[PDB]
Amino acid sequence: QTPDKAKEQHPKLETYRCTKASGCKKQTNYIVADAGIHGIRQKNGAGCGDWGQKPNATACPDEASCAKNCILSGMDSNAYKNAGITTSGNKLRLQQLINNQLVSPRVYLLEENKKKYEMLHLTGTEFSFDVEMEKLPCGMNGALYLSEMPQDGGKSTSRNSKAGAYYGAGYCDAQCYVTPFINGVGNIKGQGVCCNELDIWEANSRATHIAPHPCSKPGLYGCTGDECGSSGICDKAGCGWNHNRINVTDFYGRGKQYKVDSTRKFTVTSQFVANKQGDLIELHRHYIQDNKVIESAVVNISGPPKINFINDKYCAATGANEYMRLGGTKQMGDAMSRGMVLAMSVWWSEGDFMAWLDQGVAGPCDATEGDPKNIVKVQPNPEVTFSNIRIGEIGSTS
Numbered sequence: 163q164t165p166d167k168a169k170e171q172h173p174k175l176e177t178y179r180c181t182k183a184s185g186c187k188k189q190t191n192y193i194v195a196d197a198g199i200h201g202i203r204q205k206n207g208a209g210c211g212d213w214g215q216k217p218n219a220t221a222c223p224d225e226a227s228c229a230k231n232c233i234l235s236g237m238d239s240n241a242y243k244n245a246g247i248t249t250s251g252n253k254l255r256l257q258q259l260i261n262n263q264l265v266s267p268r269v270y271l272l273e274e275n276k277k278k279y280e281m282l283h284l285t286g287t288e289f290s291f292d293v294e295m296e297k298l299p300c301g302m303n304g305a306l307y308l309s310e311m312p313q314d315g316g317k318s319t320s321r322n323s324k325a326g327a328y329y330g331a332g333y334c335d336a337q338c339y340v341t342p343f344i345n346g347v348g349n350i351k352g353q354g355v356c357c358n359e360l361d362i363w364e365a366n367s368r369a370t371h372i373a374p375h376p377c378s379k380p381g382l383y384g385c386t387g388d389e390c391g392s393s394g395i396c397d398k399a400g401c402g403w404n405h406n407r408i409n410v411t412d413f414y415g416r417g418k419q420y421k422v423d424s425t426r427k428f429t430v431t432s433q434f435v436a437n438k439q440g441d442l443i444e445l446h447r448h449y450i451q452d453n454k455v456i457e458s459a460v461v462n463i464s465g466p467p468k469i470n471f472i473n474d475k476y477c478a479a480t481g482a483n484e485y486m487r488l489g490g491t492k493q494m495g496d497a498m499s500r501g502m503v504l505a506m507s508v509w510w511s512e513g514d515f516m517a518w519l520d521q522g523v524a525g526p527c528d529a530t531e532g533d534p535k536n537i538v539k540v541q542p543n544p545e546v547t548f549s550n551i552r553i554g555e556i557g558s559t560s
C-alpha cells in the first residue's frame with residue numbers, strides 16, 4: 163500500500179545495551195504499529211482484503227494497481243493511543259480494548275532513525291524485560307517475541323513496495339498465514355508469509371510459554387501449497403516450555419502460592435547459549451521478583467532430560483518433531499544470528515481460547531473462562547505492560 167501524507171507520530175521507547183564491564187546504557191528506540199492497524203483503504207472507503215485472504219481483486223488485479231489503489235493512513239499520537247499503544251520512559255503499554263473497541267495491538271521496535279527495524283542478534287547473548295501481567299486472565303496472550311522480518315519492511319524487494327519499516331510493513335511468522343500484503347506489496351499469489359520465529363514470552367497471569375520456531379528458509383518466504391503446511395518449511399508448533407506441562411504447577415501463577423507471582427511485577431531474563439562454533443545450543447530462563455533470582459524448575463515428568471532449559475535433547479524427548487526436522491536449535495540460532503525484529507502484542511482467540519497456553523496440562527483454566535465473552539467479565543479491560551528491555555552480554559542485563 164502507499165502511505166498517505168499524514169504525520170506518523172511513533173511513540174518513543176527507551177531500551178538498554180549492556181556489558182559486564184560498563185553496565186546498561188540507554189538507547190532511543192521507537193515503537194511502530196503493524197501496517198494493518200494504520201488503516202489500509204481504497205478511496206471509496208472499502209478495504210483492501212482480509213487476514214487469511216489475498217487482496218481486493220478489483221483494487222489489486224496486479225501489484226502496481228494494488229500499490230496505487232490501497233492507501234495507508236499515517237498514525238499520529240491519538241491514533242496510537244486509540245489503537246491501544248502508549249509508551250512512557252522505558253515502558254510500553256498495550257491495551258486490548260479501547261472504548262469497547264477490540265484494538266489488539268501488534269507493534270515492532272524501530273531503530274532511532276525510524277527507517278529500519280532495530281535488528282537483534284540474540285545467539286550468545288542475554289535478553290531481559292520487566293512485565294506487568296496482572297490484568298491478563300485466562301484466554302489472553304501478552305506476547306513478547308521475534309520474527310525474521312525484512313529490516314526495511316520489504317521496501318527493496320519491489321518498485322511498488324512503499325510502506326517500509328516506518329509504517330509497520332513486512333510482518334511474517336512461523337504460522338505461514340496468507341495475508342493480503344507480503345513485503346509491503348499486494349499478495350496477489352496468495353502465499354503464506356513465513357519466517358523463523360522466537361517466542362520468548364507468550365502468557366497470561368495463569369500460564370507462561372517459551373518457544374523457538376525454526377524454519378528451513380532464511381528471511382521472509384512466500385510459501386506455496388505444502389510449503390505452508392505442518393510438514394512444510396516452518397515448525398508451526400515450536401519446541402515449547404511451560405512449567406505446567408513439565409509438571410511443576412506451582413512455579414508461575416496468581417498469588418503467594420507460586421514461585422513467580424503473576425499479580426506483581428517481575429523480571430524475565432532469557433539466555434541464548436552458544437557452543438564454541440557460535441551455534442545456539444541451549445535456551446535458559448530465570449526470573450527476578452523481590453530482588454530474588456527465581457531459577458527455572460527442572461523437568462518433573464519422565465522422558466525429557468532432567469534440566470531447566472531448552473536444548474535439542476529436550477525438544478526431541480518432548481515430541482517437537484518439526485522443530486528437530488527443520489534443524490532444531492542450531493537452525494533457530496542461525497536466524498537469531500542474522501538478526502530478528504522485536505514484536506510485542508496483546509490478543510485473545512475466539513477459536514480455541516488460548517487453550518494451548520492455559521488449560522489441561524498447560525494450566526489451570528477451564529474450557530470456557532478463556533472465551534473472549536467471559537474474559538471481559540473477569541477483566542473488563544485486559545492489558546499488559548512490557549518495560550525496561552535490556553539486551554547485552556550474558557550476566558549483565560538483570
Ligand SMILES: OC[C@H]1O[C@@H](S[C@H]2[C@H](O)[C@@H](O)[C@H](S[C@H]3[C@H](O)[C@@H](O)[C@H](S)O[C@@H]3CO)O[C@@H]2CO)[C@H](O)[C@@H](O)[C@@H]1S
Nearest residue numbers: 268305307335336337359361373399400402507509518
Ligand atoms: O493472528 C493471531 C495472533 O497471532 C499472534 S502471532 C503468534 C505466532 O503466530 C506464533 O508463531 C506464536 S503463537 C503460537 C505459539 O508460539 C506456539 O507455541 C503455539 S503451539 O501455537 C501458538 C498459536 O498460533 O507467537 C506469535 C505471538 O503470539 C500475534 O502476536 C497477534 O497479534 C495475532 S491477533
Ligand SMILES: *[C@@H]1O[C@H](CO)[C@@H](O)[C@H](O)[C@H]1NC(C)=O
Nearest residue numbers: 204206208209218219220221
Ligand atoms: C473489493 O472492493 C470492491 C470495491 O472496489 C468492493 O465492491 C468489494 O466488496 C471488495 N470485495 C470484498 C470481498 O470485500
Ligand SMILES: *[C@@H]1O[C@H](CO)[C@@H](O)[C@H](O)[C@H]1NC(C)=O
Nearest residue numbers: 408409410411462463464465
Ligand atoms: C507430577 O509430579 C508429582 C509430584 O511433584 C507426582 O506426584 C506425579 O506423579 C507427577 N506426574 C507424572 C506424570 O510424573
